[PDB]
Structure 1
Amino acid sequence: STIFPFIGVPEDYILPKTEELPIFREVAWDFEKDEPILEKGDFKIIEKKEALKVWIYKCIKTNRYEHEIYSLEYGTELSELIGQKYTKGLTESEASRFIKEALLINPYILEVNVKSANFNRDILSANVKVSTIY
């Protein structure tokens, strides 16, 4: 509480720690049945990339302003595109922006890219690449 590190730190002084995030861990989830997974009569815990997959799935699957429990940041506005309310190019731009802005609130996710986009009948397809710290 004595040092003044704003101009420079003293040579003898040791920095307490380097700031890093803990290992991301989450209750495992199965996607074809939409349930948590029980292992030996208890919830099964996964870590790192699989936990991030679970979180991403949950974030994409929710609507933005629908629920009172969530804040204004959590969710996705992809439900406003159903029915071709906008033109096709505007729909592509909006979808890309929506997905990027929704995913980038997690501190463990570094960059999101929506590369491909195709229109076939009433289906819109896209490829999303997520880069994490791991």
Structure 2
Amino acid sequence: LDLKGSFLFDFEKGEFVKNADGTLKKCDKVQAYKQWCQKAILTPRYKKAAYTNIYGSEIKDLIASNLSQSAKELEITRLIKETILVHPYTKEVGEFSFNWLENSRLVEYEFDVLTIDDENIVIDG
């Protein structure tokens, strides 16, 4: 598999976190994976020409769509799941929850499950 790490990017500030030495703050495999997941979720699909069709999501395009509330919930689940699952490190993403707090303003939750979260059988002959 041999996945590798990356450098932190504080999305709150929109800038790379750098040590006092001036070098960018290196991060572990899982940290880089989480950063990539957030970036891919924030990246629209088919629109940023630097990427292939695999990368990105289509959540923003869904806002203008005319599908119903539950249809939009299913579309959000499908879009987030498809966007995340391209990464090899991903095992499963699910347990989606939704809360239409105001009349038409939504909050949704999801769980991402890693390949390392798998459970291994213990046996040998």
Aligned counterparts of 1:95 and 1:102: Cα–Cα separation in 2: 10
Q: Is the 8 A contact 1:117 1:124 kept in 2?
A: yes
Q: Secondary structure at the match of 1:63?
A: coil
Which of 1 and 2 has greater Rg? Answer: 1
Deviations 1:24-72 (A, max 9, x none): 3011111211111111211111013222211111000010011111111
Q: Is the 8 A contact 1:28 1:46 kept in 2?
A: yes
Name the structure where helix makes up a greater proportion of residues: 2
Q: Which amino acid aligns with 1:95?
A: I
Name the structure where strand makes up a greater proportion of residues: 1
Aligned counterparts of 1:67 and 1:49: Cα–Cα separation in 2: 25
How has the CA–CA distance of structure 1 residues 65 and 114 changed in structure 2, closer, same or farther, with 3 Å as cutoff? farther
Aligned counterparts of 1:43 and 1:109: Cα–Cα separation in 2: 26
Equivalence for 1:31: 11
TM normalised by structure 2 equals 0.83
Q: Is the 8 A contact 2:5 2:32 kept in 1?
A: yes
Aligned counterparts of 1:36 and 1:85: Cα–Cα separation in 2: 38
Residue among 8, 14, 22 paired with 1:41? 22
Q: Secondary structure at the match of 1:45?
A: coil
Any gaps of 5 or more consecutive residues in structure 1?
Answer: 1-20
Q: Which amino acid aligns with 1:34?
A: G
Q: Secondary structure at the match of 1:50?
A: helix
Q: CA deviation at 1:89?
A: 1.0
Q: Which amino acid aligns with 2:83?
A: A
Q: CA deviation at 1:133?
A: 2.4
Tell me which moved more, 119-128 or 102-111: 119-128
Q: Which amino acid aligns with 2:112?
A: V
How has the CA–CA distance of structure 1 residues 69 and 23 changed in structure 2, closer, same or farther, with 3 Å as cutoff? closer
Q: CA deviation at 1:131?
A: 1.0
How has the CA–CA distance of structure 1 residues 98 and 114 changed in structure 2, closer, same or farther, with 3 Å as cutoff? farther
Residue correspondences, number: 114
Aligned counterparts of 1:59 and 1:53: Cα–Cα separation in 2: 10
TM normalised by structure 1 equals 0.78
Equivalence for 2:107: 125
